[PDB]
Design a protein around this ligand. Structure first.
Ligand SMILES: [Co+2]
Length: 307
């Protein structure tokens, strides 16, 4: 009997939690009850940084972490979270699977005892506002609320908007009174926070593409049998396929929902946004001493291929 422990920030009822339960059920089935998964939701074991440390120490078996979040530990990995580098999740997954991604994953394993098993799509951030954003030119004068995060700030600044720091629980009222003109977040968050009640427009800016890696402690991995390793890897990939499709499906449902609420949904040309980020890309590559971002942004050879 092997009961793995999996920690996550997400709450019961969330997509992330539902996928973890699907993983538990899939492991049970595939192992005829030999592999179990116990779930520790709602950051009860700490935030992602804390749970990742538990993996390093061998005290927790599995957790979620974003590929770009590895930039905190492995500086070059931040390249994947610069705005507009990843065109979409497929592109991000290609980065994960590339020689670049393999190198980052090897370092995660060697230094921190993190074995990345898979990357799962977890949504794309989009931009709401009190006036239509038909193109990058419309960002001029836009008081755009972003979280206190470097890359979100760069998105706001380089698009030509006026970045406007502000506490998340205050945003609804700031949008309502036009103290701030817009904000940027994933579609489910926009729904949950009812930002659509106080924002007449939504722009499909696709500026930040999110994922979640599934990481297992190398301490745990090395105790598993060869066959159990394969079962876990394949269980994670199966659940990953389901998770990614669920997130994609829910995003399309959310766009339709917002339209049904009377929201004006725009699809601005994104090439000018990518062009506007070039200062940032060149700075990143210059500082790190390798053409990391330019290579990743252009890594489109297998884009949308069936593998
Ligand atoms: Co291909």
């Amino acid at each position: 009997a092997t009961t793995l422990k999996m920690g996550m920030q997400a709450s019961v009822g969330s997509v992330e939690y539902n996928s973890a339960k699907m993983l538990a059920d899939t492991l049970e089935e595939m192992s005829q009850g030999e592999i179990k998964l116990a779930l520790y939701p709602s950051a009860q074991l700490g935030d992602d940084r804390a749970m990742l440390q538990q993996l390093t120490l061998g005290d927790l078996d599995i957790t979620y972490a974003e590929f770009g979040r590895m930039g905190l530990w492995i500086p070059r990995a931040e390249a994947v979270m610069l705005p507009y580098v990843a065109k979409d999740f497929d592109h991000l997954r290609r980065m994960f699977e590339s020689d670049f991604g393999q190198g980052v994953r090897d370092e995660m394993l060697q230094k921190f005892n993190w074995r990345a098993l898979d990357t799962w799509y977890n949504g794309t951030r989009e931009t709401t506002s009190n006036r239509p954003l038909n193109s990058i030119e419309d960002f001029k004068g836009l008081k755009l609320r972003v979280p206190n995060a470097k890359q979100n700030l760069n998105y706001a600044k380089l698009s030509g908007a006026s970045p406007t720091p502000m506490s998340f629980s205050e945003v609804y009222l700031a949008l309502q009174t036009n103290a701030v003109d817009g904000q940027e977040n994933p579609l489910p968050t926009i729904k949950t926070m009812k930002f659509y009640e106080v924002q007449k427009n939504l722009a499909m800016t696709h500026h930040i593409v999110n994922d979640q890696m599934v990481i297992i402690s190398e301490s745990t991995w090395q105790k598993l049998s060869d066959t159990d390793k394969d079962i876990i890897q394949k269980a994670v990939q199966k659940v990953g396929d389901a998770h990614t499709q669920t997130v994609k499906t829910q995003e399309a449902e959310l766009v339709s929902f917002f339209k049904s609420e009377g929201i004006n949904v725009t699809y601005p040309d994104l090439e000018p946004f990518r062009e506007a980020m070039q200062p940032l890309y060149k700075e990143f590559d210059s500082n790190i001493g390798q053409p990391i971002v330019s290579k990743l942004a252009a890594m489109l050879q297998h884009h949308h291929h069936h593998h």
